[PDB]
Design a protein around this nucleic acid. Structure first.
Ligand SMILES: [Mg+2]
Ligand SMILES: [Mg+2]
Ligand SMILES: [Mg+2]
Ligand SMILES: [Mg+2]
Ligand SMILES: [Mg+2]
Ligand SMILES: [Mg+2]
Ligand SMILES: [Mg+2]
Ligand SMILES: [Mg+2]
Ligand SMILES: [Mg+2]
Ligand SMILES: [Mg+2]
Ligand SMILES: [Mg+2]
Ligand SMILES: [Mg+2]
Ligand SMILES: [Mg+2]
Ligand SMILES: [Mg+2]
Ligand SMILES: [Mg+2]
Ligand SMILES: [Mg+2]
Ligand SMILES: [Mg+2]
Ligand SMILES: [Mg+2]
Ligand SMILES: [Mg+2]
Ligand SMILES: [Mg+2]
Ligand SMILES: [Mg+2]
Ligand SMILES: [Mg+2]
Ligand SMILES: [Mg+2]
Ligand SMILES: [Mg+2]
Lengths: 176, 45, 202, 97, 41, 26, 139, 220, 123
RNA sequence: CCUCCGCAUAAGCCUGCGUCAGAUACACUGAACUGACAAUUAACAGCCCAAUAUCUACAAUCAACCAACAAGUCAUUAUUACCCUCACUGUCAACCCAACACAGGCAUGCUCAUAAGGAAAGGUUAAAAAAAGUAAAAGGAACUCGGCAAAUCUUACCCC
RNA sequence: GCUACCUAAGAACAGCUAAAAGAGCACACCCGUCUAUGUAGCAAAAUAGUGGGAAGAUUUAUAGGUAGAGGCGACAAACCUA
RNA sequence: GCUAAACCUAGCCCCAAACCCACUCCACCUUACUACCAAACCUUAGCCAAACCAUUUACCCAAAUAAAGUAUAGGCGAUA
């Protein structure tokens, strides 16, 4: 029900609510998929409750009773997400040998930089797709100069950084 | 009385100085490339 | 945290720190002796002897370590006096406040001799890593100090929203070549006879 | 008022650091070492400036010739313009002609 | 700025000391002081 | 901040004289 | 779910299911008077009213009769020390009318120092007849 | 034909004037405000045992002499305004009490012969309010003659006379932090008796202002 | 004339304002007379389990001991999923090559409702 | 006392005089200034449409006389295909273009003087010069380059 | 996105006289004859009065086009972001 | 005595050496940052110098030096 968006009535205005440890990855690994599914929704209800409380605290101009438990729940569902994703990845490697879930390809943009183009889902094949054909996956010669300039820019920055490090080290040797 | 030359319009703005307009010609592509090199936050409208 | 942020006695996230270190300020950085993580040998709750300044040749427990500044705070030693709760109409309350000390300004003390000792990170055949004195070859144990949140594990009562140890450490995972989706589909008895139709990815 | 109101931190110079103590050693490598090496070989610096001396214009021509190909585009453009300007200055301008 | 004058204060003061007893901005402003001091001398 | 020592030293000497003139010792 | 690719649908294809939903909801107190049935929520931008209906019916088992959403613009007026505009986030607001005549009201959530206090009560403010003279001395 | 105006950059005219929580570390206290059991002007044994067990070497009989020395030295360093020595001789509670008013004025306190030797009247201890913190308090009666002269910023005398000695009876309570090494007995508080004779009058005549009233307000 | 601000559905004229959205996924299509048709299958369905008698709770007891962190790998999954079955078959009876389908391997993903690559499911 | 303005839509702008708490180009210790909190809810508007052939001589003007010329602003059918519904987005303001809280610029509907919206005078005095008005004896262009301005509301020409 | 011209699809024009019109008087609207004010101004061209037009070779909103060895022009060497 | 003045270190410069960059997820050529439908290669010119200007007027191309500002070229002028 709606009361689930709020903590226990006794806990209201307690100024401190005692909370246990956040879930770790190893603990969640011990759990089954259906158990992880159920725990996901449990944690979700908890997050909604705490986010409700946080906003109400902001509204009332009062400190949140326990801000730390929100951080716990967030990292717990992060840990759970990681575990489930690990399992999906492992099974994918076994069955297909693909490292990435979503298909993609290395392409050159119009600006000449190599980008990982992530594929989108389409109903028609690529040669018939008007909007896709408009997009250019190649750089013409006029680009090459700019690429060089960019490279030089990178080098300049890198050079400065390296040099600065050296200077700092000398200062230390002068101080100690 | 002058100075009110800019009569704003989002359609005109996006059509004239937009990303797609820039990429339409090689000159415009070089315009974007120049701005990327300068490190501009705003490459186009 | 901004570049060349000045680490202070007050914690970085504190109101006092925000007052001392607003985003706009840019002060001359403090030159700090580069000490590796392993080379560091000073920990909270570990008794040290102070060698320099006021309260020299006196022993006390370290309460706080600031790694960035190479600082150790020794409670009740190297103190100056400050007024807290001062207002327009009231003088305030005098409080002894500790001044931070550099790692060179203090020395670790061996238990029984009660004298300052030089420390090296010698290995052990059984134990992982220990602190051994130069003068006398004996180990100094790592002091027990309360953690950040101060849970005190030895006396912990489970709340109504806390999972028991038994339930947490239960292994209900049977390894299989099925996704979470497939397993949950099977578990709840959801039937999807319709087959997914091929799409083009590009 | 552009004068400092405190003394600057005093300068300590170690006159007997390794660099100063061993300064000038091997300057006479040729005359005392059967002329196997020229003293000019002991010079450490830019490729174009090793054991050679010249005015600004001469130096620029030398830089362009020797490391010109390896230069950054903007740096090369600046060097080209520098030579072009120095050419005009040294050839077309001055008191004595 | 590899070399810059660090002694300009004293250079100004040499001229200004002779200008102290003048009236107006001549006594304190160097540009005006120098001209009057040359005349005085 | 200008590099050098001589000017700063001279000015210290001037300030010393000014202090002496302003507050003469007994 | 949010920040994920939705598998493309073809006519006569299977039902789209989400097993672990990514988006999260906060129940908020209204700033203006609402009908008794109305409940206000702050919603992720990617969420629809249909999604919210299903969300509340599914996870929370609360009957839902009507949902209406709006997008609130966060102020970009604020400037930092660098005179750079600070964006308050845009958020989605949802108004949910409960079914079966069920009414909801927002609950009233939120219904050393000793030594300093001792010092304060032992202040003993200076007597004006004393005329500024210290009262420490026994003389 | 025509030259267009040039605007200054906006930033030039847009300039403006430039304008403890829970943690692992806690404030270390070397003193406790107030007295555990306040001596009533006209229990000790167990308390002195509690002191002695920590000290291992403590004498009540010798304590008055030490107390006298501490008292005199503290009051003497008030004259020379050496706060460093005062901190060693005086509890952090006592320091502001005897320092705050003394600022921007001269004290010429002096000690002459004591009429009656000092003696301990009451001994009390802490009830373990803080972990690792134990406090021991000793009350001493002192009947002494003293001289006092307090001056202005400007050196004009405010209070007392320089030469003439005055009799004074004081109850002085000393506090020490036990369980803490390098700890020492320090003057903590002076107890004022309710039956005490009033202090010598000040030279200055004072005005005690009446209630300042708003126009609508009426005097009673 | 505000380049720096994010381009949003609030910003343009009438056509512009209608055309853009806030990133909500479509659940149907438009037809003649600007009528919108909601496709039921396009609407995501929340698979919410029964939480009655579920012992697990949002937080864990602090009394629970710490464990060494080991992420799951393909090698591991294979070791305690498929390896016992194939080793049993090899040691006792016969193992048939090119008949890995009995051990849970699939040559193609096309048959299944849930395809690992490319992904055909949400989260 | 003013209203030659207003209300709404379009376009443009993007939280820009709502609440609370603070420091402080006339000022209120209050501001439109700072920070926090809140808010614009779709029916209005936007966002449309299976294919292949095929059809479409006769304006509008109260469309009826009459009269036109510059000759016009809105039409389908046959066969195949087709069954799921109310999603998404705009909705605030004292507002935009003119470096400004600028006597300027700014489309449409309704109100054609208001039911809506506003205030020309910080306080005083009553100098000169300056600006805008009102009234003026007798005369009526004598003014002036010129009846310019004002008052009055005017004829007959010449050149182009 | 001003302006010169054009293209597409739009909008506006009270009242009075008129055999009925690139007609007349005259609003709104467009323009800018003459005077006064203003001249670091309300304004990098405005204000008040007086004026020219106001069913049309009219005025105007939206979107599009023509680009400098050029465009566009009822030629003023006009206009093409003061 | 106000306004002020004073400061040392963020960083940068030239070299040397060494061949750089490149996926959390999601979005991004349509009005970029918006899930989802029937086409590139092509002599640079000019300022400037020649005291005007009209032919002409140095500009990296595979690594120092020297041959040598030599042979040559060129309104046989400037210069190359
Ligand atoms: Mg402009
Ligand atoms: Mg226009
Ligand atoms: Mg809506
Ligand atoms: Mg505000
Ligand atoms: Mg509608
Ligand atoms: Mg009104
Ligand atoms: Mg007024
Ligand atoms: Mg006035
Ligand atoms: Mg006058
Ligand atoms: Mg008259
Ligand atoms: Mg005349
Ligand atoms: Mg006449
Ligand atoms: Mg005359
Ligand atoms: Mg006239
Ligand atoms: Mg008149
Ligand atoms: Mg047309
Ligand atoms: Mg009409
Ligand atoms: Mg007409
Ligand atoms: Mg007319
Ligand atoms: Mg024309
Ligand atoms: Mg002409
Ligand atoms: Mg002409
Ligand atoms: Mg121009
Ligand atoms: Mg020439």
């Amino acid at each position: 029900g709606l009361e689930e968006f709020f903590d226990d009535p006794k806990n209201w205005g307690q100024e401190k609510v005692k909370s246990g440890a956040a879930w770790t990855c190893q603990q969640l690994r011990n759990k089954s998929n259906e158990d992880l599914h159920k725990l996901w929704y449990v944690l979700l209800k908890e997050r909604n409750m705490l986010l409700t409380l946080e906003q109400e605290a902001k509204r009332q101009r009062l400190p949140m009773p326990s801000p730390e438990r929100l951080d716990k729940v967030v990292d717990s569902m992060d840990a759970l997400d990681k575990v489930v994703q690990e399992r999906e990845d492992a099974l994918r490697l076994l069955q297909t040998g693909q490292e990435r879930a979503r298909p993609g390809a290395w392409r050159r943009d119009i600006f000449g930089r190599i980008i990982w183009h992530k594929f989108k889902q389409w109903v028609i094949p690529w040669h018939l797709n008007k909007r896709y054909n408009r997009k250019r996956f190649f750089a013409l010669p006029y680009v090459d100069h700019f690429l060089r300039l960019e490279r030089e820019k990178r080098a300049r920055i890198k050079a400065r950084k390296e040099n600065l490090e050296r200077k700092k080290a000398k200062i230390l040797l002068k101080k100690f | 009385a002058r100075g009110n030359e800019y009569q704003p319009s989002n359609i005109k703005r996006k059509n004239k100085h937009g990303w797609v307009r820039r990429l339409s010609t090689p000159a415009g592509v070089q315009v974007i490339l120049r701005r990327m090199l300068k490190g501009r936050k705003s490459l186009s409208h | 945290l901004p570049p060349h942020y000045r680490y202070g006695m007050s914690p970085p996230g504190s109101v006092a720190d925000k007052r001392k270190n607003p985003p706009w300020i840019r002060r001359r950085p403090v030159v700090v002796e580069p000490i590796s993580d392993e080379d560091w040998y000073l920990f909270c709750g570990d008794t040290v002897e102070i060698l320099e300044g006021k309260d020299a040749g006196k022993q006390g427990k370290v309460v706080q370590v600031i790694r960035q500044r190479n600082w150790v705070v020794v409670g009740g030693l190297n103190t100056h006096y400050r007024y807290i709760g001062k207002t327009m109409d009231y003088r305030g309350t005098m409080i002894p406040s500790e001044a931070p000390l550099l790692h060179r300004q203090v020395k670790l003390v061996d238990p029984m001799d009660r004298k300052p000792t030089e420390i090296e990170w010698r290995f052990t055949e059984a134990g992982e890593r220990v602190r051994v004195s130069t003068r006398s070859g004996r180990i100094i144990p790592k002091p027990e100090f309360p953690r950040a949140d101060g849970i005190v594990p030895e006396t912990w009562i489970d709340g109504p929203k806390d999972t028991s140890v038994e339930d947490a450490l239960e292994r209900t995972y049977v390894p299989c070549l099925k996704t979470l989706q497939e397993e949950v589909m099977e578990a709840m008895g959801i039937k999807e006879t319709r087959k997914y139709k091929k799409v083009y990815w590009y | 008022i552009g004068i400092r109101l405190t003394l600057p931190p005093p300068k300590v110079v170690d006159r007997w650091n390794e660099k100063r103590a061993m300064f000038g050693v091997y300057d006479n490598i040729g005359i005392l070492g059967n002329f196997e090496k020229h003293p000019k070989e002991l010079i450490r610096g830019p490729i174009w400036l090793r054991g050679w001396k010249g005015n600004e214009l001469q130096r620029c021509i030398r830089k362009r010739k020797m490391v010109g190909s390896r230069m950054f585009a903007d740096d090369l453009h600046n060097l080209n313009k520098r030579i072009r300007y120095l050419y005009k200055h040294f050839n077309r301008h001055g008191k004595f002609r | 700025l590899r070399n810059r004058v660090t002694d300009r204060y004293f250079r100004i003061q040499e001229v200004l000391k002779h200008a102290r007893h003048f009236r107006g901005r001549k006594n304190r402003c160097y540009r005006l002081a120098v001209r009057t001091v040359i005349r005085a001398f | 901040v200008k590099k050098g020592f001589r000017a700063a030293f001279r000015f210290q000497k001037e300030l010393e004289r000014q202090r002496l003139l302003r507050c003469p010792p007994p | 779910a949010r920040n994920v690719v939705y598998p493309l649908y073809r006519l006569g294809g299977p039902q789209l299911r989400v097993f672990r939903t990514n988006f999260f909801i906060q129940l908020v107190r209204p700033g203006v008077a609402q009908p008794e049935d109305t409940v206000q929520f702050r919603i992720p931008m990617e969420m629809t009213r249909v999604d919210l209906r299903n969300y509340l019916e599914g996870i929370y088992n609360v009957p839902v009769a009507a949902v209406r959403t709006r997008v609130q613009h966060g102020s970009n007026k604020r400037r930092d020390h660098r005179n750079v505009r600070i964006k308050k986030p845009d958020y989605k607001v949802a108004y949910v009318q409960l079914a079966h005549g069920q009414t909801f009201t927002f609950p009233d959530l939120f219904p050393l120092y000793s030594m300093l206090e001792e010092e304060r009560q032992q202040r003993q403010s200076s007597d004006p007849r004393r005329g500024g003279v210290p009262s420490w001395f026994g003389l | 034909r025509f030259t267009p105006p040039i605007y200054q950059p906006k930033f030039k005219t847009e300039k403006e004037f430039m304008q403890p929580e829970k943690s692992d570390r806690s404030i270390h206290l070397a003193c406790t405000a107030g007295i555990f059991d306040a001596y009533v002007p006209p229990a000790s044994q167990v308390s002195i045992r509690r002191i002695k067990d920590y000290d291992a070497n403590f004498k009540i009989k010798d304590f008055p002499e030490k107390a006298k020395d501490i008292f005199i030295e503290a009051h003497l360093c008030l004259n020379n305004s050496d706060h460093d020595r005062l901190h060693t001789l005086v509890t952090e509670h006592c320091f502001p009490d005897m320092t705050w008013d003394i600022k921007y004025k001269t004290v010429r306190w002096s000690f002459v012969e004591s009429l009656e030797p000092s003696h301990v009247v009451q001994v009390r201890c802490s009830s373990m309010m803080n972990q690792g913190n134990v406090y021991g308090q000793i009350t001493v009666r002192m009947h002494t003659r003293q001289t006092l002269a307090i001056y202005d910023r400007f050196g004009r005398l405010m209070y007392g006379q320089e030469d003439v000695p005055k009799d004074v009876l004081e109850y002085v309570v000393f506090e020490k932090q036990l369980t803490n090494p390098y700890g020492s007995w320090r003057m903590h508080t002076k107890i004022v008796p309710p039956w005490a004779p009033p202090k010598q009058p000040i030279l200055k005549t004072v005005m005690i202002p009446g209630p300042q009233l708003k126009p609508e307000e009426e005097y009673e | 004339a505000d380049r720096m601000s994010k381009w949003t559905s609030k910003r343009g004229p009438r056509s512009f304002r209608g055309r853009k959205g806030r990133g909500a996924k479509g659940i149907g299509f438009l037809t003649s007379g600007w009528r919108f048709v909601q496709i039921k299958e396009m609407v995501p369905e929340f698979v919410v389990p029964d939480l009655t008698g579920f012992k697990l709770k949002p937080y864990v007891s602090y009394l629970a001991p710490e464990s060494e962190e080991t992420p799951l790998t393909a090698a591991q999954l294979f070791s305690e999923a498929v390896a016992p079955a194939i080793e049993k078959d090899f040691k006792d009876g016969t193992f048939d090559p090119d008949n890995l389908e009995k051990y849970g391997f699939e040559p193609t993903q096309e048959g299944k409702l849930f395809q690992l690559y490319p992904r055909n499911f949400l989260r």
